[PDB]
Amino acid sequence: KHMEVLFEAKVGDITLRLAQGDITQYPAKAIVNAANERLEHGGGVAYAIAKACAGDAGLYTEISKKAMREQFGRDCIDHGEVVVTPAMNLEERGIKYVLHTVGPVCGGMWSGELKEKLYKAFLGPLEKAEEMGVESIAFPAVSAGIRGCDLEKVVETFLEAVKDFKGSAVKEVALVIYDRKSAEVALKVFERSL
Ligand SMILES: Nc1ncnc2c1ncn2[C@@H]1O[C@H](COP(=O)(O)OP(=O)(O)OC[C@H]2O[C@H](O)[C@H](O)[C@@H]2O)[C@@H](O)[C@H]1O
């Protein structure tokens, strides 16, 4: 899997991990996608997940849009709303579901309102995984890429959502960072917050 675990701690009944690698290789029953509002997986982690699941990113975009329409009766999601799709080709590595979430557009800015939207984008998939009886879930750094939220602020917000979460089914939560320099930043956040 070419995955490195950098930090592990108990946060309630949840075992929380910080890992460095590709989220499409992480051993979790559900992986979270940092999607856009329309689930058009043309770039970033959304493209990576879409290409890994369906073999073609455009194909997974069609499957994701159909799932959004059936679950919400709309062609877009808001912060906190979560679309569930089958992980298809990723089922061979233990990943059964993709939980699509949408974070805010920071563009290098930070505020209480941007924090609330991101907090909802992290808590929503935890609550959806809980509702489904999913025991393990992996997250990317939602809004830290194209949406331009400061990585340190993204990791602090992710930790708030994990700490506030209440559940009986979710036992393992992981934050998966692709870049090694970015993983080091996330590590320092975990160390002073836990
Ligand atoms: N395979 C990977 N595994 C783990 N993390 C990854 C991977 N590839 C990238 N990342 C990291 O994943 C993090 C999130 O970066 P982004 O995927 O851009 O997500 P967003 O929430 O900012 O933008 C969402 C969409 O909205 C926009 O309008 C675009 O349409 C976007 O597709 C970064 O730190 C990446 O380095």
Numbering used by the authors: -1 to 192
What is the paper's account of this structure, in its own sentences?
In addition, macro domains can recognize the terminal ADPr unit and bind to monomeric ADPr (MAR) and its derivatives, including ADP-ribose-1″-phosphate, O-acyl-ADP-ribose, and the terminal ADP-ribose of PAR, as well as protein-conjugated MAR or PAR (MARylated or PARylated proteins). Here, we increase the affinity of the Af1521 macro domain for ADPr by 1000-fold (KD from ~3 μM to ~3 nM) using random mutagenesis and in vitro ribosome display selection using an ADP-ribosylated histone peptide. The crystal structure of the engineered Af1521 (eAf1521) macro domain provides an explanation for the increased affinity.
Sequencing revealed that this eAf1521 variant contains nine point mutations. To this end, we solved the crystal structure of eAf1521 in a complex with ADPr at 1.82 Å resolution. The overall structure of the eAf1521 macro domain was virtually identical to WT Af1521. Nevertheless, two notable features could explain the improved affinity of eAf1521 for ADP-ribosylated targets. First, the orientation of the proximal ribose moiety of eAf1521-bound ADPr was rotated such that the oxygen at the C-1″, which serves as the anchor point for the amino acid acceptor side chain, resided closer to the macro domain surface. This change was facilitated by the K35E and Y145R amino acid substitutions. The R145 side chain forms a salt bridge with the E35 carboxylate, which provides a rigid boundary for proximal ribose binding, while allowing electrostatic interaction between the Arg Nε atom and the C-4′ (ring-forming) oxygen.
